[PDB]
Amino acid sequence: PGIVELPSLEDLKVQEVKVSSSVLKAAAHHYGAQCDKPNKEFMLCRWEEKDPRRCLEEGKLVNQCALEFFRQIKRHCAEPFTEYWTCIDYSGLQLFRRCRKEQAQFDKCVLDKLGWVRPDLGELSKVTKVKTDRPLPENPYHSRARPEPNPEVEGDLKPARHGSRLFFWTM
Amino acid sequence: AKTLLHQYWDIPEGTECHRKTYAATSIGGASGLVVSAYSVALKTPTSFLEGVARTGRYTFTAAAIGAIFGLTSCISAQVREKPDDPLNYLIGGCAGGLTLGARTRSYGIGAAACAYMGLTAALVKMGQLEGWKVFAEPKV
Amino acid sequence: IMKDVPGWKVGESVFHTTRWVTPMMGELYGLRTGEEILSSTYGFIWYT
Amino acid sequence: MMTYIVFILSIIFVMGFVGFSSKPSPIYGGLGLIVSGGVGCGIVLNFGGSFLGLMVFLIYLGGMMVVFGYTTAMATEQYNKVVLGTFITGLLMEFLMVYYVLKDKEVEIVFKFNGMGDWVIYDTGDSGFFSEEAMGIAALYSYGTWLVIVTGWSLLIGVVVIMEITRGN
Amino acid sequence: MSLVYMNIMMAFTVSLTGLLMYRSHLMSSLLCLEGMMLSLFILATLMILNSHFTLASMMPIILLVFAACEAALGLSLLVMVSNTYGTDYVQNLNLLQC
Amino acid sequence: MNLMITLLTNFTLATLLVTIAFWLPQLNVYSEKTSPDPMGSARLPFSMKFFLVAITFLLFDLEIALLLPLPWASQTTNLNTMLTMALLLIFLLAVSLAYEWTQKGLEWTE
Amino acid sequence: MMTGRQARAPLQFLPDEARSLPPPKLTDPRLAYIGFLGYCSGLIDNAIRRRPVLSAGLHRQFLYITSFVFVGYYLLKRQDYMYAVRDHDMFSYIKSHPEDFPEKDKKTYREVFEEFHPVR
Amino acid sequence: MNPIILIIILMTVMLGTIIVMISTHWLLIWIGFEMNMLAIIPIMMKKHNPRATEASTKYFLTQSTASMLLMMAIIINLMFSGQWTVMKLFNPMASMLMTMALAMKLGMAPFHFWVPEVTQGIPLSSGLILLTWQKLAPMSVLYQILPSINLDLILTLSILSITIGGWGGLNQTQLRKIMAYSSIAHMGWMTAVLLYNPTMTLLNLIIYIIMTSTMFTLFMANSTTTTLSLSHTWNKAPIMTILVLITLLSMGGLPPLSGFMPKWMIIQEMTKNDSIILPTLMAITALLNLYFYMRLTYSTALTMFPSTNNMKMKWQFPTTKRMTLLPTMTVLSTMLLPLTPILSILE
Amino acid sequence: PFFDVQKKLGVDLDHWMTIQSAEQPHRIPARCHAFEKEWIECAHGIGSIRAEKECKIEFEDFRECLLRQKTMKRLNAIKRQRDKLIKEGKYTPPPHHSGQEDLRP
Amino acid sequence: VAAFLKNVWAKEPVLVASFAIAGLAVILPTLSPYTKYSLMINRATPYNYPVPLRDDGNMPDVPSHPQDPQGPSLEWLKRL
Q1: Taking CB atoms and an 8 Å cut-off, how many pairs form between chains F and J?
Q2: After what residues is chain A interrupted, C–N > 2.5 A?
């Protein structure tokens, strides 16, 4: 069959977000609140195209914008975030309820230095709309032409001609 | 069991008697092996050697049936100079029936086997000539 | 690797369609080390 | 040789079957079935079926084979060539399949079998914050209403049938 | 197909050949039947979990339970045989030849 | 790999202890005993009650297997259907128990 | 053969299109035969229980005849419906595919030649 | 057995067969088959005889092997198709496994060995329930999978069943074994026409069910289990002998009786497909079924075997058995030929 | 006979479990959802004969997704040729296939 | 009725207690007003990703941001 179209290694190169899982989980809510538009555009592109190779540039935007998140943490709120992600990182299940005072201090510093509001319950899990310029793929499954169905039955039901026509039976 | 009949039928009638005789002997030996397997399964022998003896007896009887039938049919089709004729297979079937009578050590079984096996072999040749089907594909 | 084998096209898909198919684990870690294969395919199940 | 672990386990599985396909004695056949059940539970454990593996340990071994051995203890009163013969025969054919599929990597008996490890056909994704098989079983009450009804009626009818037919009157 | 499919099918085949050749007892044949059911269980759950068929994961448990219920019934029949001839030998179940 | 290591360690400690218990005083020198229980000559008679409670355990164990995934199933969205099916399963279990009770099934092993 | 025809309206004894057909007459010979079968069954019922065959149980014989006639009338209606369905499908398939059913040139006997085999 | 428990068990048998008939999932087919087996086991153990226990054990072992082969076929089709819809199978091996599983369930030769055994060891009502009701669900499953049925295998099973049933019924003296071998021959007839026209399979199934019901009802009404009591029946009640003579005449395919209706129709669907040797061979073999039916009619109604002195006492008591639908089934099984086109309601 | 009680009565008893692309708990997709979906939307309502003779391409794709015969056959060919060239000494593994890649994230 | 109930409370208290508990379990969900709270607690759990919808141009009810006033609220679960 066909040859798989694959992007070159230069198309896959981007500056990574080299942080651990607890670092991301500490600032997950503010990352969702602030970096919402490129994330939602990338996820809509992924769910509509059904192909990673067609979404790569959108993915790059995520790896840009998230980085522009963390730098703003590093410039202004480095130390409370350091304490908060360390407290998150200690516990085995990375529970949020074990680090309430550090979370309060980090949120207070962020609000009074950057004006970011932490989302409430169910706010991040909402379904939102995205205005984008790329067109809707008319054939994402690459489906070919369906077979033509059989002709249907039409017309009134006339009685059987000369009955059953089974051997000597007249009807 | 389909490749044995194919290798028997792809030999043209009255051309090489050895290959036809070998193919018919193989078909008869397969039939005798099946019969002996069912006999030793359904009726258990009193000893292992008795079972091997019964299996060998059935296999040799049916192989002799096939070899004699194929040899006689090919020789008669060679000497009578007509390949497409059920009389040759009738002669081969009666020769097989006489072989059955010689194997079972009796005369009445030999005569009945001659008559019915000659009729059956003539019917088989007639069906091969006219394209009769026993396992007919559903076309209607 | 396959510059010598005749009748071989490099990157020939096994599917008649051009739609993207999620790569099977052997397609990804086919030519890697044994420990990477073990960590990738049995790391979660064998983790306590 | 670690990457063939499931395959290695599978060998013991079919080996355990020759433990009781030869039928040496109901106690030894039950022991072979116990070993085969533990090996099969390990096999399904290596595929992610933890609940189904513990179903095998809890219900097959601890539930049903216990009753089988318990009824065995009421028969086959305590105190061969054929058992050892078919055990040796089955082991020889089993190692013949092992050697052939480890040699030419592609065999066939009825279906075409591949000689690579079991790890190739695995999935590269992640299931998220749930186990897919766990919610598939958990959908027995939300989706499988008809299955629950027929299974419960079958078990009730089985209780009635069992206590009816052993009355003897 | 995979290697474990061959091994599970071979296990089913040898348990089937074990069932079809009775030696002396009936409990051994019942154990062979439960071995066949176990191999069916393993094959079905391997196929189901390989392909991420989510709902079908409810199935093999039923495949256990029903067949396990059948096993109980079989045991009762054996006990009835053991109540007549005192043993579970298969060579006493020939009263219907005539 | 940790569970397999723990299982192998427990198994090898068990067989080391069994071998030590079964072979350490075997190397001592003692005197042997003759080859010779209230029922030595009598055969074992069959009892229907033990087999009956065995099969009753098996059937209740199968219905326990059916009833088991309720902790996972309680997190569903069809809560009315889940509650109805769970109550129906336990009700059929109780119905089987009561029918075994009424027909003198639990007699002399009550 | 007709398994795909009655696949969109399943388990229908007599569909709506069956009402477009003339119902069987009450004086149908088949209905009279089914009523005669019911009367014979009533006579056998009288006979096997050691009763006067032509005398005992007039109400039972009447119920036998009535039930047989009822069931037979409905079965006959279904039978004519399904034969009409067969004819309709046959004619529709002939009309839809003209190339598979060519009209044959119907020659007279002055052009055709038939071999003469004398009997003597 | 309690009447309530017997009623519940009979509705469980009916529910299992209905579950096999109406389901679109293979697992539910398997579930219904196990329901049917588990619920029909105690009916064979109604009298608590050693023969009944051995018959139930043989039936259990055969049905267990058949159900396990059916599950293997279902699992193979699952692997090679990824779906459970009851339709054509997508592997020849699964089709072969399912076909031999349903052949073991129906009693087709060479899996027939349990049918003359088991039917001998169980009462007449349970034997009737077996030989009529247990053959509905496997025939439905065979009906649904005919695009994947191998023609060679099914025709081999059909001719083996017909020949073995005739040659087996040629020997027996017991009535139940005769009905078992007759059943084997009739299912050979029904499966021989399945791949050509399954409406004829339905018609032959219905006619066979009516005839077997009539014969077993007559045997229950006269309380006869061997041929000699059936011979004795002429003194007690002659009308019963006339009825069994007419029903045995109809069971052999003798025109103008209704038993000529199925097989002739079967020939009409096999000469259309240019298969001439097989229907002629099957009719020639069914002449043996006609032979042992003729032997039974010779023993019962066409002559008068001697009776005993105590039979006079039986002249003083009328029968009180609930002969349910006996006249209707006697009429329907014998005078149904002039309504032959009614089979078009089964198309 | 197949008495379609479910479609006549409008009830659903086992149609949710018949196929693999059906509605699932938490919308969990199977590994061959798209292939089976395409095969089903081909073969809908055209009959079994036209289904088996008209879109054999979609059924072959679905079977290839299900069992992966050709994928592991290609993997066997690649690994066998790699082992042969390793034995012949004309090939070496790159550092990124040996365990010193310092991978992506 | 009251004599029978006192009689079974005298002879078999275990069965009386079991039947009372079973009856309470079978009639109490239909009367407690907190079952709907369980239903929308189980509904509000985000197991999957809330995949966004493409803005055709007229969707006033759906929000454009997670912190927008549109969409469902969760103050009832916060308070209860």
Answers
A1: 14
A2: none
Domain boundaries, chain E: 1-86
Instruction: Give the minimum alpha-carbon distance from A26 to chain C in angstroms, rounded to a whole number.
Output: 24
| CATH classification code of F1-103 | 1.20.58.1610
How far is CA F6 from each of CA D87, D108, F3, H159, H181, rounded to the nearest angstrom? 32, 39, 5, 62, 62
* E and C adjacent (3 or more CB pairs under 8 angstroms): no
Q: Coil, helix or strand for F92?
A: helix
Method by which the coordinates were obtained? cryo-EM
Residue bearing tokens 């059989």 = A150
D74 and E CB contact within 8 Å: yes
Chain D residue nearest residue I70, CA to CA: D114
- The structure tokens listed for H249 are 């005449």
**Distance in angstroms (rounded) separating the CA atoms of residues D12 and G83:** 63
Distance from CA of H235 to the nearest CA of I (A): 44
**Residue D113 belongs to what H/E stretch?**
strand D112-114
Spatial separation of the C-alpha atoms in residues B14 and B16, rounded to whole Å: 6
Instruction: Give the I window 40-59 contacts with H, CB below 8 Å.
Output: 48
Among H244, H175, H250, which Cα is nearest to H208's?
A: H250
Handedness of CA H297, H298, H302, H306 (dihedral sign): negative
CB I62 within 8 A of CB C15: no
Q: Which domain holds residue A124?
A: 1-137
Answer whether H271's CB lies under 8 Å from H279's CB.
Answer: yes
Could you give phi then psi for residue G108, rounded to 5 degrees? Answer: -90, 175
The dihedral over CA atoms of D52, D54, D59, D61, expressed in degrees to the nearest 10, equals 120
Touching, E vs I (3+ Cβ pairs under 8 A):
yes
Domain containing residue D155 = 4-166
A162 occurs within a structural domain: no
State whether H143 and I2 contact (CB < 8 Å).
Answer: yes
Q: Give the angle subtended at the CA of H30 by the CAs of H62 and H145, to the nearest 5°.
A: 95
Beta carbons within 10 angstroms of residue B131's beta carbon:
7
Specify which residues A129 forms β-bridges with. J53
Measure the CA dihedral F86/F91/F94/F96, to 10°: -100
Q: From the centroid of its chain, how far is CA B18?
A: 15
Q: Supply the DSSP symbol for D58.
A: I
Which segments of J1-80 does DSSP mark as H helices, in order?
A: 2-11, 13-27, 35-43, 75-79
3-state class (DSSP) for residue B139? coil
- Dig out the tokens for F88 from the structure: 């129906």
Interface residue D130 vs chain J (CB under 8 A)? yes
CATH topology of domain E1-86: Helix Hairpins (1.10.287)
Q: Is D108 helix (H, G, I), strand (E, B) or coil?
A: strand
Residue A123 belongs to some domain of the structure: yes
CB H216 within 8 A of CB H124: yes
Number of structural domains in chain A: 1
**Within a domain: residue A34?**
yes
With beta carbons under 8 A apart, name residues in chain I contacting G12: 8
Residue A67 domain flag: yes
**CB contacts, 8 Å: C48 with chain F:** 2-3
I:19-78 residues touching chain E, CB 8 A cutoff: 20, 22, 24-25, 28-32, 66-67, 69
Residue H251: closest CA among H330, H319, H162: H330
Q: What is the dihedral of CA D91, D96, D101, D106, to 10 degrees?
A: -120
Answer positive or negative: Cα dihedral of H136, H139, H141, H144.
Answer: negative
Task: Select from D102, D18, D16 the least CA-distant residue to D61.
Answer: D16
Burial I46-85 (b: 16+ CB within 10 A, else e): beeebbeebbeebbebbbbbbbbbebbbbbbebbebbeeb
